[PDB]
Homo-oligomer: A and B are copies of this chain.
Amino acid sequence: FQGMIKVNVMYPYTEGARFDHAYYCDRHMPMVKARLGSACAYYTVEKGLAGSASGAPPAFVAMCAFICDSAENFYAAMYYHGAEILGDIANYTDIAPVLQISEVVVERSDR
């Protein structure tokens, strides 16, 4: 695909499953972005709070997104730096994430 893409990493919520949010934001993500370099314009991070119903847990305990100009350049970066990136995951979680690549339709409505 040619155009702006959004690579989503979405960790499903499970009661009692470990997800070290501080490590994820403070250590892991900055390292991942440093290795990705120009292959990612910016990243986003979020912490799940709730689902739709009152007291419903969120579907995902945590999520991130990598906003990139080229899907090809993103995958090439993930291939080359995969040992190091994948090797750091166990330091914050054992959850296997849902992985998706999407076309950015509206990056942000106000711009």
Residues of A within 8 A of B (CB): 1, 5-6, 8, 10, 21, 25, 29, 33, 41-52, 58-60, 63, 67, 71, 98-111
Give the complex CA separation of A63 and B103 in angstroms. 10
Q: Name the contact of A21 in the complex, choosing from B105, B108, B109 (C-beta under 8 A).
A: B105
For the complex formed, measure the closest distance between the CB of A111 and the CB atoms of chain B, giving whole angstroms.
8
Say whether A29 contacts B100, CB under 8 Å: no
* This chain: copies in complex: 2
Q: Contacts A1-B49, A6-B46, A49-B5 hold; do A60 and B106 have CB atoms under 8 A apart?
A: no
- From A60, A100, A106, name the one whose CB has the most chain B CB atoms within 10 angstroms: A100
Q: Name the contact of A108 in the complex, choosing from B10, B42, B63, B101 (C-beta under 8 A).
A: B42
Give the complex CA separation of A41 and B6 in angstroms. 20
Q: Contacts A1-B49, A6-B46 hold; do A58 and B105 have CB atoms under 8 A apart?
A: no
Q: A25-B105, A49-B101, A51-B98 are in contact. List 9 more A-B contacts (CB 8 A).
A: A43-B106, A43-B108, A43-B109, A44-B104, A46-B105, A48-B101, A52-B98, A58-B100, A58-B102
